[PDB]
Amino acid sequence: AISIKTPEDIEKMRVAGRLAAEVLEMIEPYVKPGVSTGELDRICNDYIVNEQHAVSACLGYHGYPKSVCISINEVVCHGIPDDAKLLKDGDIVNIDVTVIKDGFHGDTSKMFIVGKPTIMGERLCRITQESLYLALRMVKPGINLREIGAAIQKFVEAEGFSVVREYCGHGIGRGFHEEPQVLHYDSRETNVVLKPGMTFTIEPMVNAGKKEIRTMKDGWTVKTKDRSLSAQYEHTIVVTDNGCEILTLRKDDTIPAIISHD
Ligand SMILES: O=C(O)c1ccc(-c2ccccc2[N+](=O)[O-])o1
Ligand SMILES: [Mn+2]
Ligand SMILES: [Mn+2]
Ligand code: NA
């Protein structure tokens, strides 16, 4: 059941969200040509455990083997860190982190462009982040999630891209995935009116090509059916009385932590 977080819980969410965002800030320098997704994962976990004194929520979730998800180019999500997978020039990579601190979760991801960026890669990532931003700018009490989902899709599709249907944002707090589901496209099933105190994520997965995906035989790795590029950005937020506050904001984000509509 969708719950309203207390001022105390919200503060714990701010701490967890900050830590998650800081893992992404910390790993940035390591995302260079020649590094393996495997070592990047080890680097993230060492930081989370030893420095943040927190724990990755992904490690073991539904059986996930690693601490963070790392997806490259045509891989849509759930890419498994591998010691034999090296980043290369032109690659676009998503690193998705979720940490648990004092009982609460912080969930966020971002795209990193490796080496010399490609105009196409750079555009898919920019548009994807912008679809997330426009959605965040719509968040406030009274609005229906169906509206936000419809807006993301409309913006993305106008760019000639597509929105992955199999995955969605979600409520979050003491649990990794709580209600409600946050669809990134228009669905006749969606009907959720936002209220202050609600905490959830927005994390659109955008394909340069067709929306259809395929799961690899390792039971986790998801790729675009047509093998086109795919990007995703994610933030955890809390609905306020007149808008929202992004709990996982990073220094490289080009959107304010607090979004006011007064
Ligand atoms: O951002 C998320 O909500 C997210 C990322 C990855 C997962 C997830 C979901 C189901 C099973 C395993 C994972 N995971 O992170 O290992 O959820
Ligand atoms: Mn995530
Ligand atoms: Mn999430
Ligand atoms: Na990708």
Author numbering: 2 to 263
Give the article text.
Methionine aminopeptidase (MetAP) removes the N-terminal methionine residue from nascent proteins in all types of cells. MetAP is therefore a potential target for developing novel broad spectrum antibacterial drugs. E. coli MetAP is a typical bacterial MetAP, containing only a catalytic domain. A surface-exposed loop containing Y62, H63, G64 and Y65 (the YHGY loop) is an integral part of the active site pocket.
We report here five new X-ray crystal structures of the Mn(II)-form of E. coli MetAP, each complexed with a different inhibitor. All eight structures, including the five new ones, have the typical "pita-bread" fold found in other MetAP structures, and each of them contains two Mn(II) ions at the dinuclear metal site. A single molecule of inhibitor sits in the shallow active site pocket. Common features of the Mn(II)-form selective inhibitors 4–8 bound to E. coli MetAP in the five new structures are that all use their carboxylate group to coordinate with the two Mn(II) ions at the dinuclear metal site and all take a non-coplanar or twisted conformation for the two aromatic rings, consistent with our previously reported structures of E. coli MetAP complexed with 1–3. The twisted conformation found in all of the Mn(II)-form-selective inhibitors 1–8 is in agreement with the requirement of a hydrophobic ortho-substitution, such as chlorine, on the phenyl ring for inhibitory activity. The twist angles observed in the MetAP complexes of 1–8 range from the smallest 23.3° for 6 to the largest 52.9° for 4, suggesting that in general, the phenylfuran-based inhibitors dock into the active site in a conformation that may correspond to a minimum-energy solution conformation. The residues forming the dinuclear metal site (H171, D108, E204, E235 and D97), as well as the nearby residues S110, T202, F177, H178 and H79, show little change in position upon binding of any of these inhibitors. In contrast, residues Y62, H63, G64, and Y65 in the YHGY loop, as well as residue W221, moved significantly. The same is true for other inhibitors, and the loop show a great adaptability. This flexibility allows the binding pocket to adapt to different shapes of the bound inhibitors.
